[PDB]
Amino acid sequence: MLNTTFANAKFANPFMNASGVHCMTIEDLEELKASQAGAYITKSSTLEKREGNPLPRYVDLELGSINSMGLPNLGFDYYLDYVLKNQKENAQEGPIFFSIAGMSAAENIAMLKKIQESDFSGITELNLSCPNVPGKPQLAYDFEATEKLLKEVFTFFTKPLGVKLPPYFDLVHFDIMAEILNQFPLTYVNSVNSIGNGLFIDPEAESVVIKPKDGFGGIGGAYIKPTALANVRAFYTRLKPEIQIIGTGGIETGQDAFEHLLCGATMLQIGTALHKEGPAIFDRIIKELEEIMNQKGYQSIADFHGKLKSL
Amino acid sequence: MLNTTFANAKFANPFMNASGVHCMTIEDLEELKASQAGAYITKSSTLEKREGNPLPRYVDLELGSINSMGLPNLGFDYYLDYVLKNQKENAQEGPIFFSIAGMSAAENIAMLKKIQESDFSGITELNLSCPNVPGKPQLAYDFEATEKLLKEVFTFFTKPLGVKLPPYFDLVHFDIMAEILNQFPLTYVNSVNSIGNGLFIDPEAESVVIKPKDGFGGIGGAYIKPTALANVRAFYTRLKPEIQIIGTGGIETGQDAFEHLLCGATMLQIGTALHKEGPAIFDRIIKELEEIMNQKGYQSIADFHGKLKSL
Ligand SMILES: Cc1cc2nc3c(=O)[nH]c(=O)nc-3n(C[C@H](O)[C@H](O)[C@H](O)COP(=O)(O)O)c2cc1C
Ligand SMILES: Cc1cc2nc3c(=O)[nH]c(=O)nc-3n(C[C@H](O)[C@H](O)[C@H](O)COP(=O)(O)O)c2cc1C
Ligand SMILES: [Mg+2]
Ligand SMILES: [Mg+2]
Numbered sequence: 001m002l003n004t005t006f007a008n009a010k011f012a013n014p015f016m017n018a019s020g021v022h023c024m025t026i027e028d029l030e031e032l033k034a035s036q037a038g039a040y041i042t043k044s045s046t047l048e049k050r051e052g053n054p055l056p057r058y059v060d061l062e063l064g065s066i067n068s069m070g071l072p073n074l075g076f077d078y079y080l081d082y083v084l085k086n087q088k089e090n091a092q093e094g095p096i097f098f099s100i101a102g103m104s105a106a107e108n109i110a111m112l113k114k115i116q117e118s119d120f121s122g123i124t125e126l127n128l129s130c131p132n133v134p135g136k137p138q139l140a141y142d143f144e145a146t147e148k149l150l151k152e153v154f155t156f157f158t159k160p161l162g163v164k165l166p167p168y169f170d171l172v173h174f175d176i177m178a179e180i181l182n183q184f185p186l187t188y189v190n191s192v193n194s195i196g197n198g199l200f201i202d203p204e205a206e207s208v209v210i211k212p213k214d215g216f217g218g219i220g221g222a223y224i225k226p227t228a229l230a231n232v233r234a235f236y237t238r239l240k241p242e243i244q245i246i247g248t249g250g251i252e253t254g255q256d257a258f259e260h261l262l263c264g265a266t267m268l269q270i271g272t273a274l275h276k277e278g279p280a281i282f283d284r285i286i287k288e289l290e291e292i293m294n295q296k297g298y299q300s301i302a303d304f305h306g307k308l309k310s311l
Numbered sequence: 312m313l314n315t316t317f318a319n320a321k322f323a324n325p326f327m328n329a330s331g332v333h334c335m336t337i338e339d340l341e342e343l344k345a346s347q348a349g350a351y352i353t354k355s356s357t358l359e360k361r362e363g364n365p366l367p368r369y370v371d372l373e374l375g376s377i378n379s380m381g382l383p384n385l386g387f388d389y390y391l392d393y394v395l396k397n398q399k400e401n402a403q404e405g406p407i408f409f410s411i412a413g414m415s416a417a418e419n420i421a422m423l424k425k426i427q428e429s430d431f432s433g434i435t436e437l438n439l440s441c442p443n444v445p446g447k448p449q450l451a452y453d454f455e456a457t458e459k460l461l462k463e464v465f466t467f468f469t470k471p472l473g474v475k476l477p478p479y480f481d482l483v484h485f486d487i488m489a490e491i492l493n494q495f496p497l498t499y500v501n502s503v504n505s506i507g508n509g510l511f512i513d514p515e516a517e518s519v520v521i522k523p524k525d526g527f528g529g530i531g532g533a534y535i536k537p538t539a540l541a542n543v544r545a546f547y548t549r550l551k552p553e554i555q556i557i558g559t560g561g562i563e564t565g566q567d568a569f570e571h572l573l574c575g576a577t578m579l580q581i582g583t584a585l586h587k588e589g590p591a592i593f594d595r596i597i598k599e600l601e602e603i604m605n606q607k608g609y610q611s612i613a614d615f616h617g618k619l620k621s622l
Contacts, residue, residue: 056622063533131481137484138480138481141480169442169452169508170449170507171508171524173448173452195506195538196480197479197545199540199541199574200537200540201570201573201619203570206618207620208619208620214544214621215621215622216544223535223537226377226506226510227530229510229512233525234527263510304517308517308518308519309518310518310525311522311526
């Protein structure tokens with residue numbers, strides 16, 4: 001019942017891991033391949049391997065999570081080499097997603113050039129929103145810089161490309177971003193990355209809970225679902241139909257998934273919940289969503305996709 | 312134990328209602344005066360009385376609330392007339408706060424000029440962040456427009472003035488705003504107003520829960536505490552000491568209050584929790600905070616104010 005068509009490809013279901021969660025190593029990736037996830041994406045990579053920020057840098061919270069990982073990853077070449085080899089095995093339905101988060105415009109262009117020249121036939125996700133890199137603000141909050149980068153990207157990148165965006169909180173910002181994005185042959189928009197620079201405090205110790213950036217980190221989980229749903233819906237009613245949407249944020253139950261789909265998301269990514277539960281979450285949430293559909297008499301996501309009703 | 316000095320005035324405790332909650336009518340205000348709240352603030356007013364947005368426009372949520380009130384208020388003259396008469400009675404310790412949220416720069420300047428010319432001896436709060444006025448984005452997200460307005464304001468406004476700000480999620484934005492604000496003889500910064508344009512969905516009805524703006528509304532409550540604490544802390548380490556801070560967002564228990572104070576807030580405002588519990592909340596939360604202080608051996612807020620520890 002969850003069969004999904006996205007980026008002109010077929011997926012068994014819309015569920016995926018969110019970049020950064022359970023996708024650091026080849027072992028992690030193979031575990032996602034073995035799970036019931038409809039598709040999976042690699043950890044955002046940089047040209048060179050990164051150790052990331054000092055620990056502790058991730059903490060589970062009652063209402064979600066907080067983190068400042070600092071883009072730890074095994075490097076662009078590691079992930080490219082992996083996806084290229086798996087591609088040749090045709091051992092999975094649906095292409096693999098490849099996330100990149102260059103430390104600079106030049107690095108992003110360099111990696112995109114390499115992907116374009118390689119035989120990679122999967123999907124690429126350009127991360128314009130990492131909120132945990134010291135001294136490096138979220139690019140997608142600089143509309144001018146974002147448009148400038150994308151224009152250069154599309155002068156050469158012809159393969160499927162999506163952009164991971166930070167959350168927006170003003171309708172005019174959605175209008176501005178949509179106008180910018182609609183001018184490009186983008187495959188999709190992924191809303192949203194973590195709510196940036198939040199803070200969690202241990203009242204007993206009177207201190208923060210993560211070491212980097214004086215305790216400031218990206219917030220995920222139940223805390224951000226209202227924002228995530230709003231972003232998915234706001235872009236759904238503004239983006240040209242050629243640009244599909246991946247919904248990310250606060251997805252833990254079939255009900256949460258149902259809500260994102262009702263808003264307009266086609267694919268769904270799970271971050272915090274997956275970090276806590278492991279790959280087994282996919283089998284659980286798929287069953288929860290199917291139960292909701294069965295109760296409503298729905299046999300396909302098309303029966304309710306994007307049909308959220310206004311009052 | 313909670314005696315507080317703010318804007319050169321003395322308050323019995325730091326607790327107040329958040330503008331917009333339990334402060335619409337004179338009756339509401341008198342109820343706050345009768346409560347244990349250390350101080351209170353009026354509903355943000357406009358030059359003309361406003362009916363606000365269509366109902367339903369406010370809904371209680373398990374993790375907080377969502378709303379799109381649309382600035383319903385009885386008009387500037389109603390509130391000014393009230394505070395002026397109440398001022399003459401000397402029936403309360405600490406000045407009353409007066410919030411204004413003009414529909415335009417001209418409207419804000421007009422109200423500020425009227426306050427300046429009146430005998431009002433209390434504190435004024437300029438709302439630069441209402442996220443529920445259709446076609447009117449949050450001014451504080453337009454740094455240029457914000458600085459331009461404040462420069463004009465301070466060419467004539469000499470009375471205590473604070474600004475209610477929306478939440479920021481990028482450290483560079485805190486830097487930019489702090490630089491702008493530090494050039495003025497501002498009395499305080501109030502962080503934060505609601506997380507803007509969030510969405511809540513009733514999965515059974517497959518629809519939004521508020522009527523205006525297709526269901527998009529300001530999010531308050533537990534959902535936003537991480538963001539609220541971060542904003543209070545980020546400005547505390549960036550603002551010149553002359554500018555104090557009012558912490559607002561996700562305050563429901565003494566522990567939540569303790570956390571805001573630990574971050575650097577001097578006064579504390581309660582929105583969602585007060586909306587749900589009523590003025591009795593002040594008695595409860597004051598006792599909860601005092602119990603926390605007693606267990607830690609603290610006899611004054613100065614014992615921990617702004618002392619949040621980094622790792
Ligand atoms: C530990 C951790 C690491 C993350 N790293 C990345 C990353 O490398 N690239 C990216 O686009 N998003 C990253 N994110 C953000 C997620 O992809 C997702 O957007 C966020 O957690 C919101 O979803 P959630 O509510 O399900 O957690 C990370 C999140 C977490 C919790
Ligand atoms: C029903 C309602 C009305 C509000 N109206 C105003 C307003 O007129 N002026 C203002 O500065 N903030 C207004 N706010 C926002 C609050 O002052 C406060 O910043 C927000 O609710 C975050 O605090 P909380 O987590 O305790 O609810 C309103 C909030 C609610 C829930
Ligand atoms: Mg599989
Ligand atoms: Mg009283």
